Design the sequence.
């Protein structure tokens, strides 16, 4: 029943602060080491910080050292990551993971929490139809921050659906398209960090 | 100080034996671990101490050490073994944790031409005051492709963005969208919009086009 | 003299309880056990368990992190623990000073000074009773000599001070503080030293050396915990050559201990099969300091330790 | 891979300083005696000195004869001597080169300072002159022994601030002598060919963490550590009696942690020593026990030896 | 599934007010003692007060020591105290402070709720300032008069709204908002699996909801579980259990959003700290009729 649960991820402006939390259960984190590993969009794993209560030692990656601070409340069985002086580069999915005093390999991980750092403000997407000229779809344009989930016919149409990864535009906003192919249809877009839900019907051209 | 993981990607088929290598800048003894990460999920521990198999990990996974050279071997790829893999060093004389750049193991299959579709900007969008046109490349393999936009027979640069999906779990193909973004004024200054698609599965490039506001 | 620490556990006079002995005999385990029992028996008093061993183990024992600032033990309302880090304490007041030999004992002495002051003033963050998980024999003796050592030291400093901000007063102020500690430490009702030992040769002579030394400092010791006893004849398992032979030796010295220290509370604790860590296992273990362990009856507890 | 014994150290012709240390009661005294004996038996033409820097001394207790500030041959051997520094008497022989001596004689730290001075006066003796070839330290438990080993560094930084202050306040060459002497000591202590620290521990949870902090702390001081003695192991599966609930349960705990120790300290000599039935005391028993630091103990082979100690 | 226990309440660090109520005789007092003990054991670093607002007090009888208008530590507990407000004694002492009719005022219907409420104000005035206990558990009167009590913050506030006096209005509104705060205040309903209790219980919960009082915990008490007795006889028990089990299914269905904690009918007396503690455990870890059956007969006499 060992598990790690992260929380506190969200949107912060550059230079701002954010506090991540990693709640542990199934073991006493005092006797173990807890680590934060992050993953920038489309990038690999990057260790940023470690804490070992049993030695009072903490450790930071140079990229965050002096800006971040890792700590642990052993009475609450919870570890924390205080992120100060945040920058665009700090944008990543932040994992907490567990290591052992005799083995600094990470055996248990949390589900990860998304931290996004930008001057841009939360905005819900606009949805425009990509009407069949068969292929058709929906353009989900100009939203911030990640992520967006899209459905078709509220879950009924799943086969042939291709949902593309978002692309960051020069504006600072994200855009993606979701398509489906069918024999010659409503798309459902959900952006929680703005609490927006749009349904947009897609039909052929009126001519 | 810097773990070099190679190759950065590799294609292979079910049943193939595959080997991923990580070279350590300095001697870290046997303190290296290997992870498996699938899209959207946390990494999973496979091997620690270079060669020791972690609990619950199938026996087809193997690790060996030769000096500062570390290897991860999958003796016979299963469908589920396709993912990204990371090595990790944790030297005793240091408290640093250092990952490799990663290796994306993907499924190999037969050549498949993209079916190509083009989508003009919707009337809904033009009323908003901008114009996005999207070129859709559906279900192709291999991943490598080139898309170029031609407006009135003029090549476009710096005003398009591409997006590609992950390999389809059944078709083991990729799909790709290219989106040319212009202002409505600029959009109405030209007639013919075409995206040209080059792919190894095509004898000659295929072109889809449309005339502006011709239905 | 009953073979338990009941009277110490239920005592309402003691302010300073030192728990000490040779390395590895069970100072940390015993001090935790004593502190829990006292906290449970006396819920209206606030207890503080301080580690004066530079290699602290209170945090490891309870499985939660302690520091220079007193923190309550999770699961207890009136027991706190303290582990002073010298280099981090001086930074609040010089890192070379935090590495000087004796600095551990000095900061521990300063901590005692802080509490006697707050206890005198009836103001400040306070504890009614302080229990000490001490360093092994040698350095704990140095610590308990400090009132005598500092006393003479401040006398000599007086002259070489008068050799050349009204500094003489501050010396006088220290002499008085030291003097108050000495009288409290030599009061048998306020202060006692609980010896922990094992029934083995190297422990016997060191323990005796220690007690004799403590008495010469007018320090009270009337309690001896004999720890890690095998009780092989009660194992209900009349085999295992090692345990039988080791127990025969333990039992031999045990008769000698009982004879010599008849005036002492001689508390006998069994070697457990489990690990004595965490509040629960410490609490279960600690019950035999209050009511003596009967190997014939309480034997099950050896294996009843949570894992 | 790394052999599980101290044979390389026991037969070494280069090491001058050997520290044996670890948590309270793991077996530093027992191990330091054993190492000193093995080196003495192994290198008959060399003279060895075993010094206890633990203020509570056990060398006298272990050998069954009184040692003190002046080195004495172990009774029965030709090249092994023991010493247990007495701060009061050591300061007295400077007192009677007498208040000063006794005052400082009880100050916390005095035992670490006088141990260090023992090293200093050994350095001066080697240069000019015939003395002990190798010195083995039966150290105090972790916490204070760490203070002792920081002292070369601690004094060096102190003597810098001291010098520039004492010269303007107001003999200067006496500083330079010590300042240079301390440096010499630090050079030898950070030389892995001259100085090494043998860690002793037990396979129990509380000793695991403390042992790892210690080793790391020493490495940070550029102190060579390459050997770890895991003492008091039960090896219950080799009793061939396979009973005693307590022994099986405790051995299960020990074996568990013994796998953790093996995995982390792959590059260390990991020397495993058995819990003996008898008493490791007196020349004969200490000697019989010491052999297993040289040739690794085999629970299957040398199982009876734990029952063959004199009584 | 909502877990059939009160574990999340017992370990809560937010709740300041906990009401235990329900129909006459269903086990408010027994349950309130049980809850109070569980919380105190689970949170030793906090102080808990158990107040009886039932004019016919039973807390003294239940523990077997004398409680009164002034809070008193439960013997055997380090952080649990009980209070049984005596209206005559309270008015006597209050009237003495006045010097520095009282008999009749302590006899007027509603004085008990007024004095109970006055006890609540006494703790929020000492919390708001540095001028007590962290959590107060209420062993309430039966349904009817408890509702009048819980509606009382709204009743005073609204009457004084129409209507020194600012302080009063300020402290009343403070209790009105905290009682309507899901994280600070909650109501644990006790009931038995019998038809007369079912409809009153459903009436009670609905009423509380309309007061914006939070209720997410139901204790179904005095259950036979005659299918697990090992006897499988006794016509009365089987017949009665048959009836209880039927209504228990109905309760489980309707209150799927509720913690539905099932407590068995014990063979011994649930009196004294020892027996109340041994009973209270099943509020934290649900009672298994198959495994935990022996506890029914292990009650100290
Ligand atoms: N009665 C016992 N039974 C079983 N194991 C024990 C017992 N007492 C102590 N231990 C274990 O033996 C080891 C030594 O115990 P402990 O730490 O308390 O002694 P110590 O005097 O404080 O050592 P140190 O000198 O380093 O401070 C610990 O790992 C402890 O868990
Ligand atoms: N392998 C062993 N087998 C049996 N008994 C042992 C063994 N090792 C040590 N002992 C005994 O356990 C006790 C502890 O041994 P030892 O004194 O050498 O440890 P220590 O580290 O020097 O303790 P200290 O911290 O006080 O200096 C001694 O009584 C010793 O005789
Ligand atoms: N689970 C149980 N098992 C056995 N006896 C019980 C149980 N619960 C309650 N009782 C007994 O039933 C009687 C009623 O219990 P209790 O007094 O606690 O209910 P109550 O709601 O507070 O009554 P009232 O409305 O008058 O205030 C008591 O005599 C009590 O001892
Ligand atoms: Mg200790
Ligand atoms: Mg020793
Ligand atoms: Mg009642
Ligand atoms: Zn045995
Ligand atoms: Zn019946």
Sequence:
């Amino acid at each position: 029943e060992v598990q790690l649960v992260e929380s506190g991820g969200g949107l912060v402006q550059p230079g701002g602060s954010l506090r991540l939390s990693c709640a542990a259960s199934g073991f006493n984190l005092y006797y173990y080491s807890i680590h934060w590993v992050r993953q920038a969009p489309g990038k690999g794993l990057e260790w940023v910080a470690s804490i070992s209560p049993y030695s009072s030692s903490t450790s930071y990656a140079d990229s965050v050292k002096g800006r971040f601070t890792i700590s642990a409340d052993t009475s609450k069985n919870t570890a924390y990551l205080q992120m100060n002086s945040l920058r665009a580069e700090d944008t990543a999915v932040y994992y907490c993971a567990r290591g052992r005093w005799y083995r600094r390999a990470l055996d248990y991980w949390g589900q990860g929490t998304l931290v996004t750092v930008s001057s841009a403000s939360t905005k819900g997407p606009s949805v425009f139809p990509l009407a069949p000229s068969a292929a058709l779809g929906c353009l989900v344009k100009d939203y911030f921050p990640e992520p967006v989930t899209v459905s078709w016919n509220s879950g009924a149409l799943t086969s042939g659906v291709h949902t593309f990864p978002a692309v960051l535009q020069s504006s600072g906003l994200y855009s993606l398209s979701s398509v489906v192919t069918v024999p010659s249809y409503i798309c459902n877009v959900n952006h929680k960090p703005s609490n927006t839900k749009v349904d947009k019907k897609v039909e052929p051209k009126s001519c | 100080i810097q773990m070099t993981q190679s190759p950065s990607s590799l294609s292979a088929s079910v049943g193939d034996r595959v080997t991923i290598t990580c070279r350590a800048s300095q001697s870290v003894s046997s303190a290296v671990a290997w992870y498996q990460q699938k899209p959207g999920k946390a990494p999973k521990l496979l091997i620690y101490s270079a060669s020791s198999l972690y609990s619950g990990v199938p026996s087809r996974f193997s690790g060996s050490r030769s000096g500062t050279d570390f290897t991860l071997t999958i003796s016979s790829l299963q469908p589920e073994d396709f993912a990204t893999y990371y090595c990790q060093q944790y030297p005793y004389y240091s408290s640093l944790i250092t990952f490799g750049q990663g290796t994306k193991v993907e499924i190999k299959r037969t050549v498949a031409a993209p079916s190509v579709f083009i989508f003009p900007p919707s009337d809904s969008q033009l009323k908003s005051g901008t114009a996005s046109v999207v070129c859709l490349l559906n279900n192709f393999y291999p991943r490598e492709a080139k898309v170029q936009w031609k407006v009135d027979n003029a090549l476009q640069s710096g005003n398009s963005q591409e997006s590609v999906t992950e390999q389809d779990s059944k078709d083991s193909t990729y799909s790709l969208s290219s989106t040319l973004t212009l202002s409505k004024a600029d959009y109405e200054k030209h007639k013919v919009y075409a995206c040209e698609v080059t792919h190894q599965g095509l004898s000659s490039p295929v072109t889809k086009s449309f005339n502006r506001g011709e239905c | 003299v009953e073979p338990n620490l009941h009277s110490l556990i239920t005592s309402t006079t003691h302010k300073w309880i030192f728990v000490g002995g040779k390395g590895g005999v069970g100072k940390t385990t015993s001090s935790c056990s004593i502190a829990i029992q006292m906290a449970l028996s006396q819920p209206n008093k606030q207890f503080l368990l301080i580690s004066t061993n530079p290699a602290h183990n209170l945090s490891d024992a309870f499985g939660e992190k302690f520091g220079k600032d007193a923190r309550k033990v999770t699961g207890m309302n009136n027991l706190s623990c303290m582990e002073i880090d010298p280099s981090a304490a001086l930074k609040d007041m010089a890192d070379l000073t935090g590495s000087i030999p004796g600095i551990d004992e000095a900061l521990s002495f300063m901590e005692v000074m802080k509490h006697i002051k707050r206890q005198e003033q009836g103001e400040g963050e306070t504890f009614d009773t302080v229990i000490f998980d001490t360093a092994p024999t040698g350095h704990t003796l140095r610590f308990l000599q400090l009132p005598n050592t500092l006393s003479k030291l401040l006398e000599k400093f007086g002259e070489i001070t008068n050799k050349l901000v009204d500094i003489s007063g501050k010396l006088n102020e220290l002499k008085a503080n030291v003097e108050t500690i000495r009288q409290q430490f030599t009061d048998p009702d306020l202060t006692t030293f609980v010896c922990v030992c094992i029934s083995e040769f190297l422990s016997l002579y060191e323990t005796e050396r220690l007690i004799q030394e403590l008495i010469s400092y007018d320090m009270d010791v009337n309690s001896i915990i004999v720890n890690q006893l095998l009780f092989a004849e009660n194992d209900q398992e009349h085999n295992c050559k090692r345990c039988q032979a080791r127990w025969k030796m333990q039992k031999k010295y045990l008769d000698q201990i009982d004879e010599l220290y008849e005036d002492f509370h001689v508390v006998k604790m069994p070697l457990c099969a489990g690990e004595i860590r965490g509040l629960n296992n410490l609490t279960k273990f600690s019950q035999f300091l209050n009511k003596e362990y009967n190997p014939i009856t309480d034997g099950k507890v050896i294996y009843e330790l949570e894992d």
Notes: Chain A touches chain C at residues 28, 30-31, 53-54, 56, 72, 74-75 (CB under 8 Å). The longest strand of chain A covers residues 92-100. Residues E 24-30, 54, 58, 142, 221-222, 263, 265-266, 270 surround adenosine-5'-triphosphate (ligand 3) (CB under 6 Å). Residues 151 and 188 of chain A are 5 Å apart (CA to CA).
